[PDB]
Nucleic acid binder design. Structure first.
Ligand SMILES: [Mg+2]
Ligand SMILES: [Mg+2]
Ligand SMILES: [Mg+2]
Ligand SMILES: [Mg+2]
Lengths: 123, 143, 96, 145, 53, 106, 70, 112
RNA sequence: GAGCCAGCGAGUACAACCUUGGCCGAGAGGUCUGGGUAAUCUUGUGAAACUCCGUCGUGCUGGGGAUAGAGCAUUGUAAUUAUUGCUCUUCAACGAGGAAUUCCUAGUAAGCGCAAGUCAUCAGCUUGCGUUGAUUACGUCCCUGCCCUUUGUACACACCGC
């Protein structure tokens, strides 16, 4: 063994760089929408939630999950700083628990929750 | 008598111009040839492919000659047509702007087009002469 | 109603100067024209005045209009201090 | 331009990239018929090759075919802008790439799998067997896969 | 007095009120009227607008 | 002593047409009296302001419409004449309804 | 497919034999007398117009009406 | 100031309408019928047709003055550039608005 | 490919409107600069459908463009439940539609685009506009509705009646 199955990733290389690249780098190595978002004024989006996540990471039992960070800001994008931490994406009812992974990278928080309950009767 | 540019039936004139350009081999290539659509609505690049550009240039020159002073946007507008936009009805969207600009530049380099005041471009003397010659040739051919 | 009293006083003074007041029907507006106070506050004040007589109010076309009655004028004067032979618009300044 | 003189009859239906290139017709058309190449792309490929679009081209040459295959394989090596492609910008930090046959299908499958793994809204929709790109199924398309 | 009592209402249906009702429904913003259509109709003659053809 | 001709355009915009015409006539008369070089009353295309509106408030019943419209009438009188004269003209010949207006700068 | 697209020497020869005859030769006419399909037919027509044989009547795109000499 | 001519005209019309509305609202007791607006240079003449002209006036410049002030406040004008006048109506019965107003008043009072 | 012609309009200074002209970009779109508060500048809105010469020839084909995947753009605070645009790729149903039923009598019908309206951004909608421009009546009460007249009426909340 050497390479673990295959790299869980964005556009090329491996994980070791993902976790330690901060935000600008990520943006540079991301889609167009994301870039646009980054360009526009960031105030209240990456501020408090991020801090909370960091705190959770710090004060975990080690090996087990961090504390669940609840989120209205479902508009936010999954940057690599908080891969592993659990986020409670809001859907009117329920802060739906979403687990952030090495593949969930560069997608919106709101697109892992689903607000409605899907249709029955006939699929 | 008096030979003129208008006496020739357009398409023929354009063809002649294209031929002349080909003979010259000095209109200069853009770089996008057959890696280019020509309009934002045309689900197929130019069928002629090699050449075509020359013809386009000639057409542009002719247009310039006809009008007082012409620019890029206007040219694009003239060129573009209907997008088979889908199940939606047709709009009018303008043609390849960059390509048009390139063509204009080429013309300028040649000495067809001259930069005008107010806005856009008009015609050079040499270019005019060339056009006249082409017209004459066309007339001769017709005869 | 919750007014820093200074602002209220200022408003009153302005009213006295005028003999009239024109406001918007626009709450959330940060500061009124002429007076350096919130428009909402001014409106509230006007309403209060109306409730204890004094002012006459019209709500036409998103514009509150306000005029003082004799009693109202007197009240205003009392609030201020200014004794007699004073501004409003009950009589002309000179020739206009 | 010219009618095909000489004996002719050089192979009805050629096999290329694990798929059926149809005889006669035209190179572009053949490419299109392959699961993964389209019209404009096909045209571009033809241009690169340097064959006439007028020719029916089931009587194509072997060298030409090879060249075409090579072109299909490699965007970056040849003069293809690399934003004209099927796929572009993929894995971690790296390069744009595309396939055009069986290969293309495989790539698509892989992408789908990835999406599923991610469990993104789109992925979820795909899983369901539904409408990924938010088109209203209140009235339209009442049969489905 | 409270801090957050305002979403950015620069543009859209919410910003553009009418002059009379202050509604966001059938707003004629053509020629800088800014009038809910019914209201305009009611007053159109006074505002110079007459029916001919 | 001066006789400094600035070249002055009088605009004449209105809704009411007859009134406007009358005003124009008056202006012309004044000019004649003062005896000046001027271009006659030029008439520009009548800009029409159209407001199409569903006759209904509630949008219930048949779908009927009312095209309410406004006629704008815009005239130009170009005077090759002095400043004082222009001022005088401005002072006399003002009617209700018509928007009298002066450009002054050629 | 209904065939009549395949190209041969023999086929060419038969086509040639001959431009003479027929009041008018129209791509349409050529196909289907069961000859080489559309484009091919057009090409043949063009060839026939090289040195006499079949002179033209119309010249339009797709409405190309030709007739025997002389 | 300085806008498209048509636009300006429209604005003016709107203003006039507003004024009319205000008059209807406010000068109910006075028996107001209609406004006449003449926009000359410097001064602007706002003529008012009402039944109770004296009432409208007040007592040698009061109510009218107040109204003027209000108008100024509304539309960013200065003192002098607005001139109000309260005039009589030539034959009230020929007017319609006035009649309507009268009827309304009667109704309010409580008549058959 | 080439030819290349309209009419209604609309359009900003306290905002951010239309935006030519120049350079970058396959595009979309960026940029610098203007001109326009408007018979002046956008705008001859050189709109389409059309016309000409060539390429495919009657094969679910290059007809048809849906669903799809990816990227590039833009609007906005926010685009996943694709806003829209563009680029490549996918190529589904559908060979003129049964019972039924709509609209129409001349610059009409039908086609074709423009146009403002809503509008930060989105046109398959809408009110207008012009361009191309026919077929067949120029009658009748067969149907449908409506109108009257004469008739009959235990109805008058009037046939959903009594
Ligand atoms: Mg089409
Ligand atoms: Mg014009
Ligand atoms: Mg196909
Ligand atoms: Mg709509």
């Amino acid at each position: 063994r050497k390479r673990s199955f295959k790299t869980y990733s964005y556009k090329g290389v491996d994980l070791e760089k993902l976790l330690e690249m901060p935000t600008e780098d990520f943006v540079k190595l991301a889609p167009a929408r994301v870039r646009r978002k980054f360009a526009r004024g960031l105030s209240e989006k990456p501020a408090g939630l991020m801090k909370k996540l960091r705190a959770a990471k710090l004060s975990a039992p080690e090996n087990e999950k961090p504390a669940v960070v609840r989120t209205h800001l479902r508009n936010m994008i999954i940057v690599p700083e908080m891969i592993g931490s659990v986020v409670g994406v809001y859907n009117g009812k329920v802060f739906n628990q979403v687990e952030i992974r090495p593949e969930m990278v560069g997608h919106y928080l709101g697109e892992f929750s689903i607000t409605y309950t899907p249709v029955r009767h006939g699929r | 008598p008096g030979v003129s540019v208008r006496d020739v039936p357009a398409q023929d004139f354009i063809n002649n111009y294209a031929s002349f350009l080909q003979r010259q081999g000095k209109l200069e290539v853009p770089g996008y040839v057959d890696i280019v659509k020509t309009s934002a609505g045309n689900e197929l690049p130019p069928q002629d492919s090699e050449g075509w550009f020359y013809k386009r240039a000639a057409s542009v020159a002719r247009h310039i000659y006809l009008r007082k002073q012409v620019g890029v946007g206007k040219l694009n507008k003239l060129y573009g047509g209907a997008k088979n936009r889908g199940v939606r009805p047709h709009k009018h969207v303008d043609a390849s702007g960059s390509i048009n600009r390139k063509v204009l530049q080429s013309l300028e380099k040649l000495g067809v087009v001259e930069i005008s005041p107010k806005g856009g471009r008009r015609i050079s003397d040499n270019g005019l002469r060339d056009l006249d010659r082409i017209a004459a040739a066309t007339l001769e051919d017709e005869e | 109603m919750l007014i820093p009293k200074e602002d209220r006083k200022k408003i009153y003074q302005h009213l006295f100067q005028e003999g009239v007041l024109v406001a918007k029907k626009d709450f959330n507006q940060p500061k009124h024209e002429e007076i350096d106070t919130k428009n909402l506050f001014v409106i509230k004040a006007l309403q209060s005045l109306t409730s204890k007589g004094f002012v006459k109010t019209q709500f036409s076309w998103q514009y509150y209009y306000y005029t003082l009655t004799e009693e109202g004028v007197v009240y205003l004067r009392e609030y201020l201090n200014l004794p007699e032979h004073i501004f409003p618009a009950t009589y002309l300044a000179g020739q206009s | 331009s010219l009618v095909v003189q000489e004996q002719g009859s050089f192979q009805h239906i050629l096999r290329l990239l694990n798929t059926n290139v149809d005889g006669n017709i035209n190179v572009v058309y053949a490419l299109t018929t392959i699961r993964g190449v389209g019209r404009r792309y096909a045209n571009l490929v033809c241009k690169k090759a340097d064959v006439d679009l007028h020719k029916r081209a089931g009587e194509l040459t072997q060298e030409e075919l090879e060249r075409i295959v090579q072109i299909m394989q490699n965007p970056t090596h040849y003069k293809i802008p690399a934003w004209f492609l099927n796929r572009q910008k993929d894995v971690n930090d790296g390069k744009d790439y595309h396939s055009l046959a069986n290969n293309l299908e495989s790539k698509l499958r892989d992408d789908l799998e990835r999406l599923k793994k991610i469990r993104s809204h789109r992925g979820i929709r795909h899983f369901w067997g539904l409408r990924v790109r938010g088109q209203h199924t209140k009235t339209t398309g009442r049969r489905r896969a | 007095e409270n801090v957050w009592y305002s979403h950015p209402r620069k543009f859209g249906k919410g910003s553009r009120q009418c002059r009379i009702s202050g509604s966001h429904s059938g707003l004629i913003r053509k020629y800088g009227l800014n009038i809910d259509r019914q209201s305009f109709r009611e007053k159109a003659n006074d505002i110079g607008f007459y029916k001919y053809r | 002593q001066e006789v400094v001709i600035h070249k002055i355009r009088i605009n004449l915009t209105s809704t009411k047409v007859k009134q406007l015409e009358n005003v124009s006539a008056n202006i012309i008369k004044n000019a004649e009296t003062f005896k000046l070089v001027k271009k006659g009353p030029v008439r520009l295309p009548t800009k029409v302001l159209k407001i199409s509106t569903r006759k209904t408030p509630n949008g219930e019943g048949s779908k009927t419409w009312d095209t309410y419209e406004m006629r704008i009438h815009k005239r130009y009188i170009d005077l090759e004449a002095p400043a004082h004269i222009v001022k005088r003209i401005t002072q006399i010949t003002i009617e209700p309804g018509v928007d009298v207006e002066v450009i002054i700068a050629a | 497919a209904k065939h009549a697209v395949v190209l041969d020497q023999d086929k060419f020869d038969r086509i040639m034999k001959e431009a003479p005859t027929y009041r008018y030769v129209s791509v349409s006419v050529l196909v289907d007398r069961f000859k080489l399909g559309g484009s091919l037919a057009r090409v043949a027509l063009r060839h026939l117009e090289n040195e006499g044989i079949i002179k033209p009547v119309s010249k339009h795109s797709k409405q190309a009406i030709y007739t025997r000499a002389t | 100031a300085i806008i498209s001519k048509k636009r300006k005209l429209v604005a003016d019309g709107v203003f006039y309408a507003e004024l009319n509305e205000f008059f209807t609202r406010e000068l109910a007791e006075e028996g107001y019928s209609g406004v006449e607006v003449r926009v000359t240079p410097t001064k602007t003449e706002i003529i008012i047709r009402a039944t109770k002209v004296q009432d409208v006036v007040g007592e040698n410049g009061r109510r009218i003055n107040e109204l003027t002030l209000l108008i100024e406040k509304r539309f960013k004008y200065k003192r002098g550039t607005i001139a109000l006048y309260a005039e009589r109506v030539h034959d009230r019965g020929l007017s319609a608005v006035a009649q309507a107003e009268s009827m309304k008043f009667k109704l309010l009072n409580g008549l058959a």
